[PDB]
Amino acid sequence: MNITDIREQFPILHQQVNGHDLVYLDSAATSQKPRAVIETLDKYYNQYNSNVHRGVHTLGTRATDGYEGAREKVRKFINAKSMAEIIFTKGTTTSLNMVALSYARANLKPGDEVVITYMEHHANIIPWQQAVKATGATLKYIPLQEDGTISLEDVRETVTSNTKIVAVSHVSNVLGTVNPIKEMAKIAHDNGAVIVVDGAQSTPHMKIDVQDLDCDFFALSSHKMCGPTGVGVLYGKKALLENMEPAEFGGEMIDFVGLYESTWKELPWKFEAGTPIIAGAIGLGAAIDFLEEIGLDEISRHEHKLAAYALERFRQLDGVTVYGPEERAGLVTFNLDDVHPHDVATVLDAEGIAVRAGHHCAQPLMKWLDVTATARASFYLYNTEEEIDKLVEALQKTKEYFTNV
Amino acid sequence: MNITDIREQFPILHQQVNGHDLVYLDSAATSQKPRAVIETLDKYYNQYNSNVHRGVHTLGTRATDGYEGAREKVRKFINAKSMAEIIFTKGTTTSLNMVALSYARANLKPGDEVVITYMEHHANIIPWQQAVKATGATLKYIPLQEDGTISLEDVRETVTSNTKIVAVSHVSNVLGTVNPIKEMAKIAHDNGAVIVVDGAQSTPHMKIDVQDLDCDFFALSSHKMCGPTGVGVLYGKKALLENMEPAEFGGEMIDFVGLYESTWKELPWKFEAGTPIIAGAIGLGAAIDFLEEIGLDEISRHEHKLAAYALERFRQLDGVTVYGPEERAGLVTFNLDDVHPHDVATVLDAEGIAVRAGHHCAQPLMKWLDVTATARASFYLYNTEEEIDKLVEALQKTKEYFTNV
Ligand SMILES: Cc1ncc(COP(=O)(O)O)c(CN[C@@H](CS)C(=O)O)c1O
Ligand SMILES: Cc1ncc(COP(=O)(O)O)c(CN[C@@H](CS)C(=O)O)c1O
């Protein structure tokens, strides 16, 4: 894996910001796209754009073939059994909302429990809040260890025989934690529940295997894995998706429509109302081709190299708190003593370094850490150790400057 | 309005299909994009792609500015009062589903009536079916005149004092009918109801004025107005959108998130959960710039010219049934005597002519016409009278061939 060759594929990286070279370290918010994906979108809009499953002319069949081939690329990418288990959505948030509306709100009686965690993104929290409010069920949280990890014993103690849904993220966007999804799925099934994996932060950086994890649902976003914005994937076990009513209604997802009642299509189109995100899904397929061409194991090893390097360099700075475990994904969430994270992000952007500051759409975790805000630098397959050097040097300069104030 | 200059902007038009030049006549399914829109997507992914409202670095603010400027372009394009009334959705289907889930299912008691029409797209039918099923309300239909138009007297007789929602399309994707949306809104308000306009087929071809129409909701799709796929707009009156609960939950749309309850953001972000369709919405803004540069009145006049020409040329063929009124939009829905529409579409694609065959996601209308299937040729701002000549000549050749069989 030559990283110069990879960086040469992303045109947005080769620019300057406020005089300095661009050091993009906000991939956990969104990733950049290689020429393959952008040129896939270009070829679609330039050559064979047409509506899919709706008119059998040449361009129509070309577009339909591209769309469904992207669906099968997704099926192979995450090792799903059937592409009937692969549903194209607007993103991870929309997929989680779909599971919460079509599975949760239809399979929860009072006394049933929905268990999430303290590190969950807001997308994996509020849908469950609203579902248990609509059904009168109970929302429970799995506590976290002092290093930000989850122990399986805490899981077993939190999920009971009255639990219907375990909702948990694969990788934490704040802590960098890689949660034990496999054993958690075993635990949830032993108690008669299903498991919903928020895989928004894991899918771009590590290989996914729905079979090995035995997850009942899995949600991912394309803009974080070098794919176009506005498209994501919901994976559900075919047996579960068959008994779930559609979250949306309209064309493409119906079989027969009478004046008052209608019947639905087979999977997966039962859950894809209206004209789908054609170009977006085909570009996501291009992104999957690109990632598999580089190799997801290689990307994971590069990420772990960057993360260990960043943790060591951060420990070389004093006056910096880093949140989360040692074994982690490629992101570092931190704060500087006596400097607010927004000012850190501002002065880092003055140096052309792009980081995120705030709660990262995880306020319960922020209060769990007893912090109000937080800075974060996230790495992907185009980031170098030289960029982490620039980051830690600018952090030392920020500390020296604010101390001199 | 020079149409050669316009056709030069769409690269997909200059290709051949099965030996013949491409004659794209399926714009009612999806439209083609000019270089402005594709190059807007290219510039976004090449220069300033970043997550919006989430990290204040330079690329982040550039992307946020582009996204919100596209929102304001949409507000100007349809004359909305405030961009708090402009919500970016996945498409017309998703916007109609949002109105049906967040307004209908929360403001319908048994005895309330929801009135639609016989010509409505499936997207403007099944959401109301499911809403009245969830609430126990009543679904009613406004009958159609023998020429496929709606009379205001039939409206007044159908909508009563127990009606909460009139749901009607602005332009019919099958009939070409332009419904009297303004007077229908007056009628609905006189009976204490709101009005939901399915403007999927009107927005690309004619000027929209939410103020003049006084519609309570308006749904549009971007892929039909030269914009990217996967993005559309829901317009709701600010006073109505303020009292509607969000259809989706997650990041970006919340203010405070506790363990069990959360509070929402202001409009419009209250209805935009998760990472939004950034590139898609910015490309839709580019499409709006392009359309306003040509002029929507000019596009409407070109459409009426093409439609009158096509109606006359079709009447020059015998053995052809055309469905709908004389005054119409730029689409012709038809059938040939003793030839099935799928075969018509196949032999037209052999000549490189792209038409749609089937029910066009409007089965109730198909049975209302006492037909099972149907062919359709739709025109947009890049279609010429020479292409309609090719269409009618290929139709005559198809008639001669199938008669010789
Ligand atoms: C673990 C996890 N789960 C869900 C989401 C949200 O998915 P969407 O693609 O935005 O719909 C995110 C992304 N949250 C972004 C932007 S709020 C971040 O900067 O971390 C996530 O990290
Ligand atoms: C009046 C009207 N209302 C809603 C829709 C569907 O909107 P979407 O953008 O697909 O979500 C359509 C488009 N129906 C397409 C493809 S099914 C046609 O070929 O006619 C429509 O014409």
From Swiss-Prot, chains A, B:
Tell me which residues this entry annotates as catalytic: C361
Query: According to the UniProt entry, which residues carry N6-(pyridoxal phosphate)lysine?
Result: K224
Signal peptide residues on this chain, from the entry's feature table:
none
- The set of disulfide-linked cysteines is none
Enzymatic class: transferase
Its keywords, alphabetically, are: Pyridoxal phosphate, Transferase
According to its UniProt entry, the protein's GO biological process terms are: cysteine metabolic process
Recorded catalytic reaction(s): these are: (sulfur carrier)-H + L-cysteine = (sulfur carrier)-SH + L-alanine
Q: Which InterPro entries match?
A: Aminotrans_V_dom, Aminotrans_V_PyrdxlP_BS, Cys_dSase_SufS, Cysteine_dSase, PyrdxlP-dep_Trfase, PyrdxlP-dep_Trfase_major, PyrdxlP-dep_Trfase_small
GO molecular function terms attached to this record: cysteine desulfurase activity; pyridoxal phosphate binding
The EC number on file is 2.8.1.7
The record, for Gene3D superfamilies, names: Aspartate Aminotransferase, domain 1, Type I PLP-dependent aspartate aminotransferase-like (Major domain)
Spell out the activity regulation.
Answer: A Cys to Ala mutation in SufU (Cys-41-Ala) has been described to be a competivie inhibitor of SufS activity and a non-competitive inhibitor.
Required co-factors: pyridoxal 5'-phosphate
The protein's role, per its UniProt record: Type II cysteine desulfurase that acts as the initial step in the SUF-like Fe-S cluster assembly pathway. Catalyzes the removal of elemental sulfur atoms from L-cysteine by using the cofactor pyridoxal 5'-phosphate (PLP), resulting in the production of L-alanine and persulfide. Activity is stimulated by SufU, which acts as a sulfurtransferase that receives sulfur from SufS via a zinc-ligand swapping mechanism and transfers it to SufB.
Q: Which family does it belong to?
A: Belongs to the class-V pyridoxal-phosphate-dependent aminotransferase family. Csd subfamily.
Q: How does it assemble?
A: Homodimer. Interacts with SufU; this interaction induces an opening of the active site pocket of SufS. Interacts with frataxin/Fra.
Recorded protein name is Cysteine desulfurase SufS
Species = Bacillus subtilis (strain 168)
Ranked from the top, the taxonomy reads:
Bacteria, Bacillati, Bacillota, Bacilli, Bacillales
